[PDB]
Amino acid sequence: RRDWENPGVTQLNRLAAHPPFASWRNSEEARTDRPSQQLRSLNGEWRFAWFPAPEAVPESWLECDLPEADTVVVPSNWQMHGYDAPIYTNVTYPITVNPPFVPTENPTGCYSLTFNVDESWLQEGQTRIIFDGVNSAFHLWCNGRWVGYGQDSRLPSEFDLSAFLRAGENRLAVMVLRWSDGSYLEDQDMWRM
Amino acid sequence: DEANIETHGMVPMNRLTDDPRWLPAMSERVTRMVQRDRNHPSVIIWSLGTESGHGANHDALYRWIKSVDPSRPVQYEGGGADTTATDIICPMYARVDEDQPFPAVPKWSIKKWLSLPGETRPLILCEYAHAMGNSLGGFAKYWQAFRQYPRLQGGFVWDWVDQSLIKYDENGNPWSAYGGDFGDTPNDRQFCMNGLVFADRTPH
Amino acid sequence: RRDWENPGVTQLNRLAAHPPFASWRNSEEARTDRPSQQLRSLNGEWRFAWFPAPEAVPESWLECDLPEADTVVVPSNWQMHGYDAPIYTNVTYPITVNPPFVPTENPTGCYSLTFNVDESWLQEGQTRIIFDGVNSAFHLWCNGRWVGYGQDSRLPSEFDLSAFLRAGENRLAVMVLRWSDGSYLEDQDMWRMSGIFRDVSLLHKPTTQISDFHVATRFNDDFSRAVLEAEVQMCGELRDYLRVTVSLWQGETQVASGTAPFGGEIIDERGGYADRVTLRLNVENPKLWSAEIPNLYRAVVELHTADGTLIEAEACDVGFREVRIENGLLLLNGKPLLIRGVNRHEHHPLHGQVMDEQTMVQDILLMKQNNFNAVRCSHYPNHPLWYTLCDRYGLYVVDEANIETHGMVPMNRLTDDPRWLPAMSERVTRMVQRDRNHPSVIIWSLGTESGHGANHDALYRWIKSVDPSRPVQYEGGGADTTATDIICPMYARVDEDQPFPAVPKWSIKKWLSLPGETRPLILCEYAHAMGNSLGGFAKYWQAFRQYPRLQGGFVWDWVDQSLIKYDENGNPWSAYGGDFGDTPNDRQFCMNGLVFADRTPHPALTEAKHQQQFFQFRLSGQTIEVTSEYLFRHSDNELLHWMVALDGKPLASGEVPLDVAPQGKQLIELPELPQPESAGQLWLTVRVVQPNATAWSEAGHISAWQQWRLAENLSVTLPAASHAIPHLTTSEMDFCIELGNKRWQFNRQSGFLSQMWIGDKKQLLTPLRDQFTRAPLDNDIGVSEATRIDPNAWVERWKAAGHYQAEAALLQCTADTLADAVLITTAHAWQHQGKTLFISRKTYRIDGSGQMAITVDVEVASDTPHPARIGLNCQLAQVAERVNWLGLGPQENYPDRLTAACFDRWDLPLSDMYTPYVFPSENGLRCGTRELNYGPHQWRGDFQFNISRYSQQQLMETSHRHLLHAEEGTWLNIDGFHMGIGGDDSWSPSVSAEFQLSAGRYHYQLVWCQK
């Protein structure tokens, strides 16, 4: 399935959209808008590898960090890290106009992260992952198992990781595609990253 | 608040937005936006996106919003700035006194646009006074009209900050780069710099 | 991927929807609409194998026929071949409600077809396959390779097989799933079946082709001039030499034509559509289309080169008509319509939901023959041929999207969820893209019973934007939401409000004038014709005619959804909910039609025909005023026949040609009617007859009728004096009376006439007793179940009050000898647990002439539920071939459903005095009867009666008509009064107050004698 070349598939297993949540367990913290122990940020150093196309991504990556990958800061546009060139085009699409298809040479960004989750999250409640922005489409894996897929580079994509998380170390695998059928709806006059 | 939808490069511009096949993809960019930001008081108007012509998908989504959230007007400039999918006449670069009668999507003088037969909507340019390089000549002409005409309620200058990027030379000294400076081609060169301030926020 | 449990995946590799194509390579064949060599049918014998789930299907099936498979005909529903059971459920979903998931045990139908494909089809062009209907989802394979997937059981799914085919033998494998996420949007109240129930075919199109085309017709103020606008789209390589020619034909005469190269007008800053072209043809004095005169033109769309070389041609029938709502009225060609509509499901007693041309033609003819001019596709796009037939025969059509989520809680849980907007949009948009060129379709419907959600508002606007030529309606959420141009309630009553919270059903007359309301009102459903129903139908039509903005409605519904099953002896019988083991099920609720599944009319059909007549009549003196309700046609195929009779005895008759303009009037002066030579009531009956046969009716067809009482001469002459005097004999247990060869016996213990003798042959099998109950009609029952009682239903109120258990208690029984007669006086009280329900006081006067005059006076406790009837009954020993009566007929008629019946002398075989409702109940009643004759018996008076070989007891104890058995003798029920049957709906008391027996005291008299 080349879900990234089908406008009929804009996501897979993605949760419903909603207003900003923090899941406070103290009304006074909610009122004052202070931090919430139930909302953790995964921003920081991640592992990253660049590929010319998704077909070039090694399957071992799903359950094992790629030795040749680099440690980079997230969030970020990989063009700003020098992996490939940012493209500045106004009206004309950066790829051949042939919907819903995109170029076979599709820059793929493979992000990964090893993290731990406090025990209590594993015994009760629902734990979801929130990607406020991924350009322009991606597939998600947690501990080697496929979780979901999502499009639209400017809105959050959320997925329930409750059934995927384990005690100790967990690993996220995010394969980001530069181009997708979603690109046909994102032809803004700005740098294409 | 504007939906992440722009199909400017299509020919015609509404080839996708008038196609029911793309209604699903388009609807999610609109509906998920409203679901996320509808509680923000700062958001006072919803936008269906930009430069995607005027397609039947815009009308459907326009009505969806009007139904889901009647507290905010909905605007969209595609297809002539005054279609059935916008509550506000929101032209891009329409001039103060001079008409630009392009076929199908003319940009009437804003003073004239307001009184076209049957027209009663407020007019707020979603884009005007292209601030590219040494620009903003004639800016005062817009504000004199905004103040004299009740229904001419302003607009949004294009735009805030230059989209120039930092590159370094041999001596590791930084310089502002634009289209094509990364080997990117085809590219549109300096057309990515239309701000009132430099990328570092230094005022023009 | 479990695509069948993902509302985000409604298809894979499916081609865009479009109007009917045939890819003619000859313009003349396109014009005449003859067959096309480029459109083959793959209908016929296929290979089929049934599996309990998709995971049980062997991979070998993808490239090799399964030996265990059977050869079956396609199209078809596999439940009809017996592979599994069809399920009948109304509102509750046939599967657990857990969107978007379905049962793991999901019946899977594996179809396959080995067929040939000629090399010419593969050497060039595009070969695609078209599945007109697959219920409810399927994956497709061609020569072992996966092609695509499709959902929405009521619209065609097309795929390009150009790259999968080979010259010679090919094999298609189709895995059909019974359940899918699509099922959540298909909760219509009908049998739940599955399979490839619609046509399958192969269509060859050129590389450069016509990919779509829209036809529009706009007019000037008086419709004296029209402009036909045709937008045509193409696929393939764009070239300057390409051209499109749209020609309009009226028979073999080309009336107009237009040619132009591709390239539309500039649309936006990026230009226009280079792959599109709009042709505009001027048409002077166009012949207008309507259900009255279905005038049609032929539009031929030719894709060709600059100098005339044809690439391909498509075409359609064009009906010049304008549909618009103005000032609160729905107008057709500038005239306010009056919809005589009916809801019609696609149902066949043997084939299930497979539709064939014969059946469709038979339905249309019956509909038009019974004065219907409109039909609603309840509740999904129909078989494509349906629209073509409606275009040609002339019926107004409401095309409806296949969307119904009745079983959800609340009803709009999915339709208000943006996550289901994609699935919903495809059912609406693909429908419009398919049927937008059919003139018969005058209104689009967004579906039914799915509440009102934001998705409806979005799609409503989409249609309004894409096709401004037709109004859009939708009843969900209150029938008057922002998603409907027409107030279209279901079962809203005429004068009575039903103020339900949130979604009240206002009296239709009240609904129109609610503050701020200005829209027209047309019920999308009314007069629920379930079983013995349609009582009160005349009230709706009187309102429709008096109020301009009340423009009709669609009766629910056309045909009973019963299915044929065979007994141990191989004889067929009609089955309903649960008869296939299906459970849960909603029993007989699937049978609400005006006609039986085999299309035999129910008695109600005639009441509808009469009320939907297109000619109205008024009588003044000897002048009959005929008014035409036709909006466009003159009465050029009608003659008025009149007849005057004295109590059934023809006095005079004649004929007069009708020449009335649409909405015009005609005065007909009847000649001098000579006074009768005897006493009695003179009756005038008029009938509109169509001399000539038509495309929908045969010569001599009766389209309308009406009756009037003329002069009446009350009899004042007393009977010839008798010399004989009946002799009264008394015993401890009986009061016997004898006169000549006749004898009467009254049981002194029961107080009823226990026997009568002609000569010395017994006349009764059961004593003549009072009866205050009736075998419950479906309307009496409502949704009351034995395990789920609804206390409000009439049957429940009667049961709770003990009307069915009441025992007659003798209060009096005397006998007096008069000058020339014997007088028996009786009095009974029916009590239930100390409560006196009824009191019956009678007198039987037997004179020397042998006549027994029975006088009855009944008292009804004001606080007991109003009784179903007030009469007498007995089982006669006689079993005669015919029934002759002077009263309303010839068909079954009840107090609130007798406008269609006429007063006259009727004679029918006993069998016709019984209406075979699949679910047995009180039936066959005839009202306003002054004389009844059966065998040597004659009853005179002013009563209601029904007569058959079935007792009320058997009828109420029997669930299916094929289980009834003729009892000994003939059961006779003679009522002085009978309650209405109702029908405004069949799930709440619907009998209007004026037809309820609430007078408290009743009186009636009957004379029983021998002829």
Ligand SMILES: O=C1O[C@H](CO)[C@H](O)[C@H](O)[C@H]1O
């Ligand atoms: O119409 C427009 O004009 C600007 C030109 O700089 C810029 O491209 C905006 O994104 C676009 O909406």
Ligand SMILES: O=C1O[C@H](CO)[C@H](O)[C@H](O)[C@H]1O
């Ligand atoms: O409201 C309705 O009433 C009918 C009852 O027989 C039938 O279920 C229709 O499909 C439904 O729309």
Ligand SMILES: [Mg+2]
């Ligand atoms: Mg996609």
Ligand SMILES: [Mg+2]
């Ligand atoms: Mg642009």
Ligand SMILES: [Mg+2]
């Ligand atoms: Mg699905």
Ligand SMILES: [Mg+2]
């Ligand atoms: Mg229903």
Ligand code: NA
């Ligand atoms: Na102003």
Ligand code: NA
């Ligand atoms: Na720019």
Ligand code: NA
């Ligand atoms: Na009316």
Ligand code: NA
């Ligand atoms: Na029903």
Ligand code: NA
């Ligand atoms: Na005539």
Ligand code: NA
């Ligand atoms: Na019964």
